[PDB]
Every structure is written in structure tokens, then in C-alpha cells.
């Protein structure tokens, strides 16, 4: 199945997306920092999600959090998460070039009550996440997002940021994907409420031109 992934996605995307539909998602992505690809808005065909899930549960059995270099050992994940077809398509949503170049990958695995990935920003512009396994909404695990913010590393003022803004909450079901503007959207996961609530996330980090400019200047400018 390898190397044919490109044609498989180019066909799937071309059949399911008009340019106008992509521009509506671009509007939503700019407004909210967040686009969810659920069963009503698939971006990757179901067979490849089951495959990526299979690869992730295998890497989880040798962890919980799986660090980037371990995740990078999967050839399927590298092929999908760097597919020029997928990156070009998603740049219609970001309305800017995506640069798939560090901590490139990560697999979170939550299970015990109060499991959380607390409020934070990331140093890169984009997060492309696969919610391979998600507990029911009542068990927690939703993503929460505060767009149009920024990380002041000398005084992040997370709680004062919440007082100035409204929090969006996104429920996820197993197999959902989502794109996040991870540098200006403060985000977190909702703590798990039960033990035995399995939450497995593949996180993929990409850059924009602004992230290359920050590297070249060593400065937020």
C-alpha cells in the first residue's frame, strides 16, 4: 500500500472537496484556530486511519508518551504526515505554505482519571492531530482552545488570558482529525473523569514561514 498513498489521497480529496468548501474551512480556521475533520468532513480515508491507529497502538506498547524519534520509525506515519498531496491541500485551509520541518511527532496516551495535557501554546504554527482513540464525551478528553492569543514566555498569564477571552470546547470521536493554529491558540485537553478512559493522540507539528523567520532572527519578528 506504500507509495500509492499520494494517489489515494489525491483522488479522495478531489472527489470530496470543492475549492469553495476549502475556502469556508479557511475562514473557520482563521476565525477559530481549529478545523475538525470528523465523519462529516473526512480528509483521510477510513482505511488509512485504521492503519495509522494500528501503527500507533503498536508504538504505544513500547512507550504514557511516545517520543518523536520513536514515532518516526513508522514508515506509514511518515508517508502520510509528509504527503505532498495532504500538505498542499491543507495549505488551502491555512492560506500559507506549510513546512513539514526537532520534535516532529508525538503520541500521547491517557488512561487514568485526571489525565490532562494542561494549558499551553506551541512554538510552531500548526498542529495536525489524529484522535485515534477517544473515550465518550462524558469521560472527558475534549480539546479546549482560546484563539487569537500569544505565548509571553516571561509571563504567560494563562488564567488572566482566560478572564479576557472565551473558551471553545471541541468533542472528538475515535478517528477524528483536526488542524490547530498552535502558536496563537492556547489549548489543553479536558482532564479524564474515569479510569480506563483510553485517549490516544498522534500529534504532528509543522512550521510556517513565520517559524523559519523566528529561527533566522532568533526573535519574534
- C-beta separation of 29 from 74 below 8 A: no
Sign, Cα dihedral of 20, 26, 31, 32: positive
63 marked as part of a ligand binding site = no
148 marked as part of a ligand binding site = no
Altogether, the residues listed in the chain come to a count of 221
CB of 162 to a second copy, least distance (A): 4
Spatial neighbors of 22 by CB under 8 A, at least 6 apart, are 89, 92, 93
109 marked as part of a ligand binding site = no
Phi, psi of 198 (to 5 degrees): -90, 125
CB of 91 to a second copy, least distance (A): 8
Spatial neighbors of 186 by CB under 8 A, at least 6 apart, are 119, 120, 121, 145, 146, 149, 151, 158, 161
In this structure, the strands spanning 126-133 and 176-181 are: antiparallel
Q: How far apart are CA 151 and CA 184, in angstroms?
A: 7
Closer CB to a second copy, 26 or 99, in the complex: 26
CB of 81 to a second copy, least distance (A): 22
Closer CB to a second copy, 45 or 156, in the complex: 156
The C-alpha cell 491555512 sits at 94
Closer CB to a second copy, 23 or 64, in the complex: 23
Interface positions with a second copy (CB under 8 A): 20, 23, 26-28, 30-31, 92, 95-96, 137-138, 140, 142, 147-150, 152, 157-160, 162-163, 165-171, 184, 190, 210, 221
Distances (CA, A) of 57 to 89, 182, 196: 27, 25, 16
187 marked as part of a ligand binding site = yes
CB of 170 to a second copy, least distance (A): 7
Q: Interior CA angle at 17 toward 100 and 76, to 5°?
A: 40
40 marked as part of a ligand binding site = no
Closer CB to a second copy, 100 or 171, in the complex: 171
CB of 118 to a second copy, least distance (A): 10
Closer CB to a second copy, 89 or 206, in the complex: 89
Residues flagged as binding site? 120, 122, 178, 187, 199
The annotation places the binding site for Fe(2+) at 120, 122, 187
Query: Which residues make up each annotated binding site for 2-oxoglutarate?
Result: 178, 199
Amino acid at each position: 500500500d506504500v507509495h500509492e498513498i499520494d494517489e489515494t489521497l489525491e483522488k479522495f480529496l478531489a472527489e470530496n472537496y470543492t475549492p469553495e468548501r476549502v475556502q469556508q474551512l479557511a475562514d473557520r480556521f482563521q476565525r477559530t484556530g481549529f478545523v475538525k475533520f470528523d465523519s462529516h468532513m473526512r480528509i483521510v480515508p477510513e482505511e488509512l486511519i485504521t492503519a495509522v491507529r494500528a501503527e500507533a497502538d503498536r508504538l504505544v506498547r513500547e512507550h504514557s508518551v511516545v517520543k518523536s524519534q520513536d514515532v518516526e520509525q513508522s514508515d506509514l506515519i511518515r508517508a502520510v504526515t509528509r504527503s505532498e498531496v495532504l500538505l498542499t491541500f491543507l495549505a488551502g485551509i491555512t492560506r500559507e505554505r506549510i513546512i513539514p520541518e526537532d520534535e516532529r511527532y508525538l503520541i500521547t496516551h491517557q488512561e487514568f482519571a485526571s489525565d490532562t495535557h494542561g494549558w499551553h501554546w506551541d512554538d510552531y504554527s500548526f498542529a495536525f492531530n489524529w484522535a485515534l482513540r477517544m473515550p465518550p464525551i462524558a469521560s472527558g478528553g475534549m480539546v479546549q482552545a482560546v484563539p487569537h492569543t500569544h505565548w509571553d514566555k516571561n509571563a504567560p498569564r494563562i488564567n488572566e488570558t482566560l478572564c479576557e477571552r472565551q473558551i471553545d470546547t471541541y468533542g472528538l470521536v475515535s478517528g477524528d482529525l483536526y488542524l490547530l493554529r498552535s502558536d496563537t491558540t492556547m489549548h489543553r485537553t479536558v482532564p479524564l473523569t474515569e479510569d480506563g478512559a483510553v485517549r490516544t493522540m498522534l500529534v504532528v507539528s509543522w512550521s510556517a514561514e513565520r517559524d523559519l523567520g523566528k529561527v533566522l532572527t532568533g526573535n519574534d519578528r
